[PDB]
Structures are given as structure tokens and as C-alpha cells.
Amino acid sequence: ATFHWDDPLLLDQQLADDERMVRDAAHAYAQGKLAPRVTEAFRHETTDAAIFREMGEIGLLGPTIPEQYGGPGLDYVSYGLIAREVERVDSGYRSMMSVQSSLVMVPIFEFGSDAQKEKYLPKLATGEWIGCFGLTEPNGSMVTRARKVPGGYSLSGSKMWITNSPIADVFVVWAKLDEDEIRGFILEKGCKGLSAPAIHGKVGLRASITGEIVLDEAFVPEENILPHVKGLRGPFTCLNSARYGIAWGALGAAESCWHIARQYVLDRKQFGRPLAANQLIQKKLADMQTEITLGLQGVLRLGRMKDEGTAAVEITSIMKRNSCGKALDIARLARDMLGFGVARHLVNLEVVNTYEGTHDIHALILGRAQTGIQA
Template sequence: MAAPTTAQPALDPLDFLALDALLDDEERAIRDTVRQFVREQILPEVGDWFERGILPREVIQELAKLGLLGMHLHGYGLPGASAVAYGLTCLELEAGDSGIRSAASVQGSLAMFAIWRWGSEEQKERWLPAMHAGEVIGCFGLTEPDAGSDPGTMRTHAKRDGGDWVINGAKMWITNGTIADIAIVWARTEDGEIRGFVVEKGTPGFSAPEIHKKISLRASVTSELVLQDVRVPAESMLPGASTLRGPLSCLNEARFGIVFGAVGAARACYEEALAYAKERIVFDKPISAYQLTQQKLAEMVLEINRASLVALHIGRMKDSGTLRPEHVSLGKMGNVRGALEVCRSARTILGGNGITLEYPVIRHMNNLESVLTYEGTHEVHTLVVGGAITGTPAFR
């Protein structure tokens, strides 16, 4: 007797493996809200922002209105959303632009998380509600001109002077730095500890000049932080962190968002390439009918679905408490590299149109060159994974 047949659902080119079914109702609702926001308020403007090299401060205020800043943290009036919900938010924001996701990520996963995880109760109560509401913008100062992948060689130092700390040094490639109201600055103390300090805008000796002439992440504010005899009170120090574990834990939070965010950039380029291929007529038929174009599109679908599954699984691990930093390194390493390949392939489908800001592809492609490097370079994450599977660290 033949087995009963079940009608198969139609195949969706935009969700080839029907991954939407793996999300619960709340996760889909959050994702759809952010997706609508991006389509209505980001996509119509972001090409112009990229061309002009700006990110209006009002965009961060809009993110705050949606409750997205520090959304995965709990207590102090914060939403306490799941890791997966936060990851899906990063995915949709980066489908708009990596700079938008970076602004939210630096605010919530770096600056806010540093205070939430390592700060005093007074610091948490003073800063976290205001940062969630977008009233206070934060940045995170760890990377230096000569200390990127090896933050242990940082030269920024803090010295006790009576009841104060005096900080000297410089930080580099700091997202939100110029527009930030506070900076979380990491410095080495006289006794060799690594300490974080909340440095407020306007403190004498502290400045945050913006970095210009970027070709990538142009819809994002990138800055230097300069500290010349910056004096801060003792209560500005984050009391919970005294080693590199402090700033590195914050970076791991931000990297988690990138695992999802890269999928958003790749998806945006694939969707544009698919639509374009169906409309572009060459030799009397759409280029989507040619084998080479179909191969490119099929490889894109494969990568996006693979990366989506990796991101979702890592998100579920984070929610269950089983996620390790090495897992995040694997996710960032694979998903960003894969997203770059998707964007580059999409650019070839669009031909000359692929290099204009009338389409999102070259913008995402350029942005991902930065994403490949920041929050740990591709090479560093490769060595993290390599060390984890062999038991032999290869950094030194």
C-alpha cells in the first residue's frame, strides 16, 4: 500500500530551506519590526549617507525608540531579549548597512555591556537606562595604532594621583567616537592591570577627531581617541575588570552580532542580484536563464542558508549557556568570508550597475572588507579555531 502523500509547500527563493519555521513567534515579530524599519527609514537614505560619509545621530535615536540598544541585557530597565532575537536584529540592521549594525553593536554589546558586566551599581544605574534610551551615546576604546590584534601591548596607561586617575594614550578605529557622550577607555595601570574607565565627553585633555577618507563603513562615524593627561575620578573606573578578560568579553559580545549581521549583508546582495538577473536582457533573454548566472545564484543561496544555520545554532547555544568564544570565532570567520564572496559574485551579475550606489552591492562589499578585519581579524579567528582543535596555540 502506497504511503500517503503530503502536499509540499512552494519553494521560496528568498528562504530556500524554509528557515523561518525555526523561529518562534516572538523572534519573527522582532525580526519583522526591524526589517520594516530598515526598509522604510534606512534603505531610502543610506546610499546618500555612504556617499557623504555621515551617520545622522537621529538614526541612533530611532534605534532607541525601537528598544534595540542593549536589547539583550537585562535589569536596569533593559529588555532582556534572547540572544537569537538580538542576532536577528543585527542581521536585519546589516541588511541595511554594516554601519547601522555597528552603531547599535558598539552601543549595546561594547559600551553598555562593559558597564553592565564590569561596572559598579552606581555606574549601571547612572548610564544604562540613559544609553538604552539613546540619551547617551557610548564608544569603546581598546584598539590602538600599534595594538590591534594584540591588545596586551597597549600603550595607553593610567596612573593614580591622589583620589583620581590620570590617563594618557591614544585609541584608533573607534566607532561612534566623535559623537559619543562617554567612552569606555581601557588602559594599563602601574601595577600591570588592565582597567576600564568611563571618560565623559568634554573632560579636559580628551578629544575624538573623526577619521575621514574611508572607502568602507562610510555610513558610520569612525574616530581616534586622544587622551592627554585626562583626569577622571576614582569612581569612573569599572571595578569588576582588572585583566584583558574584561575588554575581550565585550568583544565577544560584539562578534556574536557580526555572525548574524554578515548574513544580512549577503542576503541583501543576493536579493538584488536575483531581481536584476530576471530583468536584465542579454542576447534576447534574461541573464537568469544562463548557466553561469544560475551557478552564481545557486552558490549564493548555498552560502546564505549555511551561514544562517550557523548563526541560528550559535544563537541557540548562547541562549542555553553552552556557547564558547571559540564558537563565535568560527561563526565570524566563516560567515564574513562567505558574505564577502556572495557580495563579490552579486557585483558581477549587476555588471557596471554593481559599482553604483543606486544599488546596495558595492556598498555592502566595501563594508564587509572592514567587517572581515574588525572585532578580530580573519587571521586571528582562524588561529583561535586552529588552537581549539589542535590544543596548540599558534599566536606566539
């Protein structure tokens, strides 16, 4: 009976062996390739699309996509472990990857035609083609609209804060159309009326490239609309999948913060003694450990529930709210101990925590589910 400060509940022992190598894969990749890049990349907001090629080579894009389509046919827990390990380096990297996996690949696999699945998935899976997701507009009821035309759609609108957009080959875009239903459309790079100007001067997620998608009478052929989804269900299946992945990821960022802070305090001294000798510092460390340890249990359990089909979408709201909130708290706690990879993790998480608005959308999904009553 031996104590592991860094893994108190021996998560290692709760993973399948299959799951444990996915994790180490993602780990070796993130540490070997992303850690040496991240500092200058964050600092200068530098576009590097190498992550796609690289991650695609080792089978980490579209983790839940079947082998039939070039995916690695893994389960949800593996998806989670992958995101955890990448965010352990940087939220911006994780972000790029959850765009490929949850925001582009998943809607094509789930909602697309045979022909669409065959054309896009395999190249997405290898990261030869990079994808982006256009739902968000400038300040789920969009004005971006598709109208029917000769064979057969024309899109006009704007989508703001689209990660990958300026380098994307493939575009999953959501617009209204009637016979008013929200629909998903597949556009490709270099297409008439489609542009994607980059955004610079970000405070957080500076290691990912972000842009808009500007659609000025952009022509989508009939064969490019997602056949098997209409309405909220489409965007929502995508966000639900991504929020799951962000819930594991945020914990990775938090672990980094905890380790850096722990190591900092071991190594530096005050009044002839390490900071670690300090009770206040020990309390803070105790809380980081605790919140992270519990969070991991929550996401592990949600992942198992997804895999066996026993998980309602509302669970994802618990884990995503919690994971981001506590990761943010932990980063701030770690920051106020130092006298700086932590500062990076901190502004990242500041963006990540408020991404889905400022009125705590998940607290409400959950309030409504407990009470029956909408806020």
C-alpha cells in the first residue's frame, strides 16, 4: 500500500492496456514535439500546421472514427486521454485537434452521406486535410443563410472566431434553409465567395490560428449538404463531443500548473528554507491535488458511460463546467505562488472558460434538468 502524490487514485490502474498506450502515444508526441515549439509559438502567434500532419501520422485525429474511414477506431476514454496530454502542453494545440475530431470529422461521420464519408474522413484522419467549424456568429439562432440555386445552394453570412479557418482545406458550416431549418454544408478551400482572413492580437490561445469564414454568395453543390441532420441536433452533437474532450483537456492544463507550482516551491527558498515548508503553500497544493483527482474520476466515468451508451448529454455539462472552472482556479492559485509557462496556461484557460458565453450556460442545462423549469 504505497502512496502516489501525483496519481492518488491510481488512474493508471483503471485504464485498459489499449487505453494506456493511446495515452503514452499522445504523451510522447506532446512532450517530444509540442513542448519545444510552444513558448515562441505562443509569444509570436505563429502559424504552424505541422501538428496536423504529425498527429495524423500517429493516429490521434478523429479518435472515435472507425478504421473503415481511416480513423483509429478508439473509444471515448482514449479521446479524453489524448486531449488531456495535448492540453498538458497548450490549450491552443488541444483546440486545433478538437476542431478536427469533434467539430469536423464527427459531423461528417454522423450526418454525412457514404460519398462524403469516403471523400473527407480518410484525408482528415491523416491530417492531410485540415478542417474548421463555422457556427458562432458576431454578437444558436444564426442569420447565415443558404438559399436554393441551380444544383444547388448559395451561402451568405459571417462566422467569427473560427479556429483553423485560415489554413483549412474543408469547412463544416451551419446555416438556415427551408421547405427554416439549420443545416450543415461542406465547403472546400479556394471556392468562389469563400474567404477566411486570420485574426491576430489574441490574449489567449495564441498558439492556435483563428479566423473568420466570410461567405459572400458562396456556392455549395447539392452533393455537399449533410443529408441526415436538421436543426439544433447537428451543431449540438458537435459541441457535446467537443465539450467532452475539453473536460479531459482542461485537467491536463491544470496538472501542468500543479506540477510547475509544486516544483517551484521545492526549489526556491525563503528565510533559509524552501517555500514548501510553508503551511499556506501546503494547503494550496492540497486543493490542486484534490480537485484534479476528483475531476479525473468524473471524466473517466463519463467516458465509460459514453462507450457503453449509458450517458445522457447532461453529464457532459457537469464535467465541462467543473473541469474548466477548477482548472482556471488552479491556474490562478499556481500563478499567485510564483515570484511562467503557468501564465500561458492561465490566459489560455481564461479564454477557454468563457468561450461558451458569460452566463454559465451549463449551470442552467443542469438547473433545468433537476427542476423541469427553464431559467
